[PDB]
Design a protein around this motif. Structure first.
Motif, PDB file in Angstrom:
ATOM      1  N   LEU C  49     -10.182  -5.174  -1.305  1.00  0.00           N
ATOM      2  CA  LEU C  49     -10.766  -3.853  -1.130  1.00  0.00           C
ATOM      3  C   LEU C  49     -12.270  -3.865  -1.298  1.00  0.00           C
ATOM      4  O   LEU C  49     -12.965  -3.080  -0.652  1.00  0.00           O
ATOM      5  CB  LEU C  49     -10.155  -2.870  -2.120  1.00  0.00           C
ATOM      6  CG  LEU C  49      -8.801  -2.306  -1.727  1.00  0.00           C
ATOM      7  CD1 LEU C  49      -8.428  -1.219  -2.674  1.00  0.00           C
ATOM      8  CD2 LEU C  49      -8.853  -1.789  -0.316  1.00  0.00           C
ATOM      9  N   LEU C  53     -13.787  -2.200   2.330  1.00  0.00           N
ATOM     10  CA  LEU C  53     -14.014  -0.763   2.248  1.00  0.00           C
ATOM     11  C   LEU C  53     -15.443  -0.410   2.637  1.00  0.00           C
ATOM     12  O   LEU C  53     -16.401  -1.043   2.190  1.00  0.00           O
ATOM     13  CB  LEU C  53     -13.725  -0.245   0.841  1.00  0.00           C
ATOM     14  CG  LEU C  53     -12.264  -0.016   0.443  1.00  0.00           C
ATOM     15  CD1 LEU C  53     -12.158   0.579  -0.953  1.00  0.00           C
ATOM     16  CD2 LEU C  53     -11.501   0.816   1.469  1.00  0.00           C
ATOM     17  N   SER C  60     -11.541   6.114  -1.233  1.00  0.00           N
ATOM     18  CA  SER C  60     -10.886   4.838  -1.498  1.00  0.00           C
ATOM     19  C   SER C  60     -11.570   4.045  -2.606  1.00  0.00           C
ATOM     20  O   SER C  60     -10.903   3.285  -3.317  1.00  0.00           O
ATOM     21  CB  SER C  60     -10.837   4.005  -0.227  1.00  0.00           C
ATOM     22  OG  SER C  60     -10.114   4.656   0.797  1.00  0.00           O
TER      23      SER C  60
END
Ligand SMILES: [K+]
Ligand SMILES: [K+]
Ligand SMILES: [K+]
Ligand SMILES: [K+]
Ligand SMILES: [K+]
Ligand SMILES: [K+]
Ligand SMILES: [K+]
Ligand SMILES: [K+]
Ligand SMILES: [K+]
Ligand SMILES: [K+]
Ligand SMILES: [K+]
Ligand SMILES: [K+]
Ligand SMILES: [K+]
Ligand SMILES: [K+]
Ligand SMILES: [K+]
Ligand SMILES: [K+]
Ligand SMILES: [Mg+2]
Ligand SMILES: [Mg+2]
Ligand SMILES: [Mg+2]
Ligand SMILES: [Mg+2]
Ligand SMILES: [Mg+2]
Ligand SMILES: [Mg+2]
Ligand SMILES: [Mg+2]
Ligand SMILES: [Mg+2]
Ligand SMILES: [Mg+2]
Ligand SMILES: [Mg+2]
Ligand SMILES: [Mg+2]
Ligand SMILES: [Mg+2]
Ligand SMILES: [Mg+2]
Ligand SMILES: [Mg+2]
Ligand SMILES: [Mg+2]
Ligand SMILES: [Mg+2]
Ligand SMILES: [Mg+2]
Ligand SMILES: [Mg+2]
Ligand SMILES: [Mg+2]
Ligand SMILES: [Mg+2]
Ligand SMILES: [Mg+2]
Ligand SMILES: [Mg+2]
Ligand SMILES: [Mg+2]
Ligand SMILES: [Mg+2]
Ligand SMILES: [Mg+2]
Ligand SMILES: [Mg+2]
Ligand SMILES: [Mg+2]
Lengths: 26, 75, 100, 101, 177
Positions: C49, C53, C60
């Motif tokens: 992530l 991202l 998020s």
RNA sequence: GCGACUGUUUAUUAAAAACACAGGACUCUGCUAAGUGGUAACACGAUGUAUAGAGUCUGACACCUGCCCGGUGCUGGAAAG
RNA sequence: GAGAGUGGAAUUUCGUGUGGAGGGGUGAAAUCUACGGAUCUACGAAGGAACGCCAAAAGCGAAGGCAGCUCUCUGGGUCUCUACCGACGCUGGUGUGCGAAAGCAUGGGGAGCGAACGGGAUUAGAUACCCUGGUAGUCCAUGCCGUAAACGAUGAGUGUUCGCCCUUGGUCUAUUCUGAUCUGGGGCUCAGCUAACGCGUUAAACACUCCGCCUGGGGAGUACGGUCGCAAGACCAAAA
């Protein structure tokens, strides 16, 4: 705090904003 | 929405056109068309008032229907 | 050709990779919820992530920060309860020791 | 993933142009390590409004569907169909468990 | 070595079109509407003339009609250009060239720019703006606009009558097109 | 107080608050570009192309820059006369 | 939630046929706009912004908030399990982050709307309300600011407490049409509570844990000081 009590703060704030834009602009 | 005129009968065709205006929901959307801008903060208040009048009309219709159904049954 | 990993979405690949990581760290054979298994899975998710991202995707990133703090809580549990598994996870996943 | 590539051709496009575009997309899918499971033709369809292009306005079209197992990047890699003159519309959707007849 | 390169792009070409052959040149009549272009010829085969400075680009507005294409230039003008003239797909490189700023006078001298003296700082023998005691713009309530050292105005949309005649002729010829 | 700064200037009575400056803005220029010099050819602009070239005013930076197009200029306009 | 594509209606502007006298606007008018041919009518072009119906006491999100459709990437939630694990929990000073709108900085964009401003009116006056033009702004990209009646004017969490009617998303049982159990969202209510209005299993009830905050009104969210901010200002915040 009712609208009637809010109006006193409203007027104090308007006068202060006016004074601050008149004095601190210079 | 277009409607044919049959045998020169204007009133029948106009009644049919009015019925198709109403039952297609287009009349409700035309009546809801606004002439000025409405903020979302005022749309919320309008939706609240419309729900309140809908609640009152549903309650009134329920009372009339209960009275009429209980009376027509012969008790 | 149909079952090639190039034909798989990123979510399916994450599912397969996390199952592999969970197999690598388990205490028992049906173990999928011990603290070191959760730490290893969280480390894999955190690393994925932090790279994929977007900067503008704040919603998020809040979940990613939640994953970070969950991993801290699990590591704190393992440091006082199972010191051997604590050292196992810190060595194999390359994490620092922060008892403070 | 498994996808449905919907292709709405202009009604004047001949058989050879349809085959050429379908085969170009198919060779694009093969080059990215993909499988074509299905190709079908829905014939000529009537549109709900008149789709207006630089040619003019069209009220008919030829509908094709290719079902492919392909890379997740393929909808981005198919953006050349936005500049294709044989097409009225195109759409890539994830494959659904619905009978289309 | 070379055949692998000409084959690697053949598997690129069949899934690609004009709008991402960046750096490639072809005639304007081979292009589409809305294509972003630069390095446009005025005459076919003469060489690129029109969109050349850093960051600049043009846009194709119309298809070839009577052998000419309509193109929106960086100035905001539109011109009908011969369809056989070539152009390069994309924008010109170094697009941050126009926002970089100098910090000292020496950087201008490095570029070969020598200092400029204002006309009001001179004498009447030197400039039409020269003269006067103290700071003065050497005109008044019955003077003229700000002018060049040669007396021609440089405010208020002035241009010479030759320029007006030529531009009116160009606009009238392009209106019939 | 003035000028932002390093610079420049009346060789031989004035070195400065004057000029320049980086920064800001306005107007013109579609390329045989505008502009400049020449009767012209031609040359510079430029083996550059509007993120470029020219002219003008202001003059770092910070905060800002109100009203007036009647006048002098510049500029746009289908006709009638 | 972020990214990349794409769609049509309507508004405005422009063009081309047909057509000729107004249009626009008000309580009434006028400015405006229109014989250089408008409004109106058909077809077309450009452009920006917002997404009708679905559609709402629905849904999702910690809050602020989130609406055309497709795809990519991604956060959280719900249900079921004879699966794992084994108190790893709650709250949270100082801190950190997110945070309508307006505003600021740089670059784009600009249909409609519209602070400022120009004009037309009303009026005793009219620095307004009404009309007509309309700049910033409203939109995008990247940063700053850090405030709202940021409201349920109701901190977060845990346990317990008679029912009825709906509804979101599941599961199970069904016995052909419904029951049961979770999950959120609503309406009503026995109690109990409440200064009163009212609240009432999503409590303002019966108890508890932890944090924030209050101590008559005015002066005053003012003065001073510190920190932060490009500014506008913000936070902590007195006394006579
Ligand atoms: K107040
Ligand atoms: K100068
Ligand atoms: K002078
Ligand atoms: K001289
Ligand atoms: K002088
Ligand atoms: K003098
Ligand atoms: K100064
Ligand atoms: K000196
Ligand atoms: K001097
Ligand atoms: K004037
Ligand atoms: K004038
Ligand atoms: K929810
Ligand atoms: K949630
Ligand atoms: K739901
Ligand atoms: K009640
Ligand atoms: K409870
Ligand atoms: Mg109170
Ligand atoms: Mg002098
Ligand atoms: Mg002279
Ligand atoms: Mg003087
Ligand atoms: Mg003195
Ligand atoms: Mg000096
Ligand atoms: Mg020195
Ligand atoms: Mg010196
Ligand atoms: Mg001397
Ligand atoms: Mg001396
Ligand atoms: Mg300069
Ligand atoms: Mg030259
Ligand atoms: Mg000066
Ligand atoms: Mg001025
Ligand atoms: Mg804003
Ligand atoms: Mg701007
Ligand atoms: Mg007025
Ligand atoms: Mg108005
Ligand atoms: Mg307006
Ligand atoms: Mg507050
Ligand atoms: Mg709110
Ligand atoms: Mg249910
Ligand atoms: Mg409930
Ligand atoms: Mg109370
Ligand atoms: Mg709290
Ligand atoms: Mg305050
Ligand atoms: Mg202070």
């Amino acid at each position: 705090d009712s609208v009637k009590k809010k109006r006193k703060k409203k007027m104090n704030k308007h006068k202060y904003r006016k004074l601050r834009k008149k004095q601190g602009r210079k | 929405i277009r409607v044919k005129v049959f045998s020169g009968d204007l009133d029948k065709a106009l009644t049919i056109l009015q019925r198709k205006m109403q039952s297609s929901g287009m009349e409700r959307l035309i009546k809801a068309q606004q002439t000025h801008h409405i903020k979302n903060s005022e749309k919320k208040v309008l939706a609240r008032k419309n729900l309140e009048r809908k609640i009152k009309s549903i309650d009134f219709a329920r009372k009339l229907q209960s009275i009429l159904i209980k009376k027509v049954r012969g008790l | 050709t149909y079952f090639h990993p190039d034909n798989m979405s990123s979510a399916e690949k994450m599912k397969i990779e996390l199952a592999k990581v969970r197999e690598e760290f388990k205490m028992s054979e049906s173990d999928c919820g011990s603290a070191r298994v959760q730490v290893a899975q969280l480390t894999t998710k955190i690393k994925h992530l932090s790279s994929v991202l977007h900067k503008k995707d704040k919603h998020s990133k809040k979940g990613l920060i939640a994953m970070v703090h969950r991993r801290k809580k699990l590591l704190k549990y393992m440091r006082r309860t199972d010191w051997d598994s604590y050292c196992l996870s810190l060595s194999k996943l390359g994490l620092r020791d922060n008892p403070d | 993933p498994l996808y449905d590539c919907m292709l709405l051709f202009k009604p004047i496009i001949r058989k050879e142009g349809l085959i050429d575009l379908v085969a170009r997309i198919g060779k694009h899918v093969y080059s990215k390590n993909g499988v074509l499971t299905e190709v079908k033709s829905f014939g000529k369809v009537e549109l709900g409004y008149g789709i207006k292009k630089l040619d003019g306005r069209h009220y008919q079209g030829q509908l094709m569907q290719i079902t492919m197992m392909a890379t997740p990047n393929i909808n981005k890699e198919l953006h050349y169909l936005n500049k294709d003159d044989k097409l009225l519309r195109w759409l890539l959707v994830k494959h659904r468990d619905i009978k289309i007849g | 070595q070379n055949k692998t390169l000409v084959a690697e792009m053949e598997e690129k070409m069949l899934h690609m079109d004009i709008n991402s052959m960046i750096g490639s040149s072809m005639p304007l009549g081979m292009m589409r509407i809305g294509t972003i272009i630069h390095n446009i010829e005025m005459n076919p085969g003469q060489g690129a003339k029109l969109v050349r400075a850093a960051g600049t680009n043009a846009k194709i507005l119309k298809e070839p009609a009577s052998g000419k294409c309509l193109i929106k230039l960086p100035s905001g003008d539109t011109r009908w250009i011969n369809a056989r003239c070539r152009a390069t797909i994309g924008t010109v490189s170094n697009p941050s060239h126009g926002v970089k700023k100098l910090y000292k006078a020496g950087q201008s001298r490095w570029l070969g720019i020598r200092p400029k003296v204002r006309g009001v700082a001179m004498n009447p023998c030197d400039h039409p703006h020269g003269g006067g005691e103290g700071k003065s713009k050497s005109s008044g309530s019955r003077g003229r606009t700000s002018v060049s050292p040669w007396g021609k105005p440089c405010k208020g949309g002035y241009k010479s009558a030759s320029v007006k005649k030529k531009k009116k002729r160009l606009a009238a010829r392009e209106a019939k097109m």
